[PDB]
Design a protein around this ligand. Structure first.
Ligand SMILES: NC(=O)c1ccc[n+]([C@@H]2O[C@H](COP(=O)([O-])OP(=O)(O)OC[C@H]3O[C@@H](n4cnc5c(N)ncnc54)[C@H](O)[C@@H]3O)[C@@H](O)[C@H]2O)c1
Ligand SMILES: NC(=O)c1ccc[n+]([C@@H]2O[C@H](COP(=O)([O-])OP(=O)(O)OC[C@H]3O[C@@H](n4cnc5c(N)ncnc54)[C@H](O)[C@@H]3O)[C@@H](O)[C@H]2O)c1
Lengths: 312, 312
């Protein structure tokens, strides 16, 4: 069981490598890759931690060494923010990085499950998908846009409001991963009942959580520690499922029946080959159906943007 | 149970806070403080993780709000390295930071156990002690220098060499926290015998474990993630002992009988008021007894250096 992390030297990368080193099952292997020179050292730093998990770091323009024999590849490489670039700039830079890395993955470990964390996710898994097709190795069951962060913030906010135990709430979240494309199915949360005003407020807080962090760090960056935690959960769910465990359900952004959009985030049953079964989003409330229809256009443009990036 | 972390925005601090946010028992509270303005956002970032541990972060030059009601204070503030600064420069900077911070601790939460991570630990815990004395609130049972890092590194190297599972080895380390004052009692590792050569090699490596990480980072970085891990285990040990758990033993740098030096790291039984019992280092090997006496004068100066700092 070998897991590869691309963009390991970054905030999200270090918090993820750290949690994975101390949580992956024994015998498991962890390789880190990043263009930053410090990457081999990050690995050395983590190797001093006494767990049954081998770990190595690599730098350079070639990530082959890190990808060889990998069963899981988590991509958190990219850019969060830099002085001088705006909305367009970030996308322009992250799209290229994703294109390159998924490209190297296609040639090195085409059978690995790929979790993409790099934003914007709605558009980046599309780029990834298109890059895999042009190589003849695309398998929509093994391409996932990591949206777990939305799920845990929801669990947290709901627990806080209804005074529940944080670890007893599991809110399914569908749609996309940005502003109005994030849709928490608050109507499907066992036990708790919500007020229309609370569904309106919560939903708003969940959709803006990322921004809430950025403003708090005062331009100092975006969520890294919570995202690292979120990616870890997703990483282990995949490993567990890839190892034969039963009933591992997780919400992710995959290519399913285009009933709403080519790629949509919905409950998935994970197994030995990635997605085993895309599950029905079930019953939705008036508020939920309205929020859904009112965002399909936006999600489709995000996806469109992505496909156009590859196919020109 | 309120735990405070000073310097929470640094490399070590963020890994530490992350690990504590998810591992402190339910009901615990975590308050982060650092001069970096990004600090409250670090807390907001971490508050999005669903664990029953309340968290708040603060910045500015007054740690009071973070210190009020604190049961445990972990200090990791300081300077790992800055261009243009050499050995003595770093020391003066770190010495002054620990002085300023302990003083605030003395004023706001005088009965909290203090765990100093800032290096050089051999000198910094001495400084803290003096600061607490001059304020008239010193309690030698509640001040510790965190040396756990030397422990986990030893555990990892030993298992690797004698082919054991990383998690089943526990090497006691005594003395100081730097260079020659780090003495791993390899002779006490049950069911494992070593060659005067093995001991010679393991011992020198364990003492240079850090440098190993620095060189692997092309000179621009230090062991941050393994340190966060080590400080997490230490902190969790203190919390558990403070909650009344029995049998919690941990090697830490504290003041005891001046049998070897005023401050000496040795196994300790932790209890409800901090150090409850200072256990004997037990039986040493020839090599060990020999390494011990050979470093005593160095450790004593490290200590003298800290006492003279807080008096001129
Ligand atoms: N899915 C989510 O919920 C979510 C939440 C927050 C952020 N993100 C996104 O994840 C990414 C990670 O941001 P971060 O905070 O870690 O940023 P960061 O800048 O701290 O880390 C990014 C890392 O990428 C590395 N990198 C750059 N180009 C690379 C390349 N070609 N190959 C490999 N590594 C490369 C950098 O050296 C750096 O260490 C961003 O794009 C961010 O927008 C996703
Ligand atoms: N005990 C050990 O085993 C061990 C191992 C390695 C490093 N360390 C030491 O721990 C410290 C942490 O290093 P790091 O890698 O996190 O460095 P870092 O630079 O990443 O973090 C240090 C933090 O200290 C903060 N700080 C500085 N002055 C402050 C003040 N007066 N009040 C509050 N916060 C202040 C900084 O803003 C920064 O976030 C260093 O002194 C390092 O030498 C200890």
């Amino acid at each position: 069981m070998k897991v590869a992390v691309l963009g390991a030297a970054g905030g999200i990368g270090q918090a993820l490598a750290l949690l994975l080193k101390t949580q992956l099952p024994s015998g498991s292997e962890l390789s880190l890759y990043d263009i930053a020179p410090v990457t081999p050292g990050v690995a050395v730093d983590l190797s001093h931690i006494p767990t049954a998990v081998k770990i190595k770091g690599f730098s350079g323009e070639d990530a082959t060494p890190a990808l060889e024999g990998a069963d899981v590849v988590l991509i958190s490489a990219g850019v969060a923010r830099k002085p001088g670039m705006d909305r367009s700039d970030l996308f322009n830079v992250n799209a290229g990085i994703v294109k390159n890395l998924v490209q190297q993955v296609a040639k090195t470990c085409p059978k690995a499950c790929i979790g993409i964390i790099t934003n914007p996710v709605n558009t980046t898994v599309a780029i990834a998908a298109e890059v895999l097709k042009k190589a003849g190795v695309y398998d929509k069951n093994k391409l996932f846009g990591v949206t777990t962060l939305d799920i845990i913030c929801s669990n947290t906010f709901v627990a806080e409001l209804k005074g529940k135990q944080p670890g007893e709430v599991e809110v399914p979240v569908i749609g996309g991963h940005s502003g109005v494309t994030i849709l928490p199915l608050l109507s499907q949360v066992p036990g708790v009942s919500f007020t229309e005003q609370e569904v309106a407020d919560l939903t708003k807080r969940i959709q803006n959580a990322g921004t809430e962090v950025v403003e708090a760090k005062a331009g100092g960056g975006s969520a890294t520690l919570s995202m690292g935690q979120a990616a870890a959960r997703f990483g282990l769910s995949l490993v567990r499922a890839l190892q034969g465990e039963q009933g591992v359900v997780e919400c992710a952004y995959v290519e399913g029946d285009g009933q709403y959009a080519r790629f949509f985030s919905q409950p998935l049953l994970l197994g030995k080959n990635g997605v085993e079964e895309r599950k029905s989003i079930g019953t939705l409330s008036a508020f939920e159906q309205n929020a859904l229809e009112g965002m399909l256009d936006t999600l489709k443009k995000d996806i469109a943007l992505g496909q156009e990036f590859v196919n020109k």
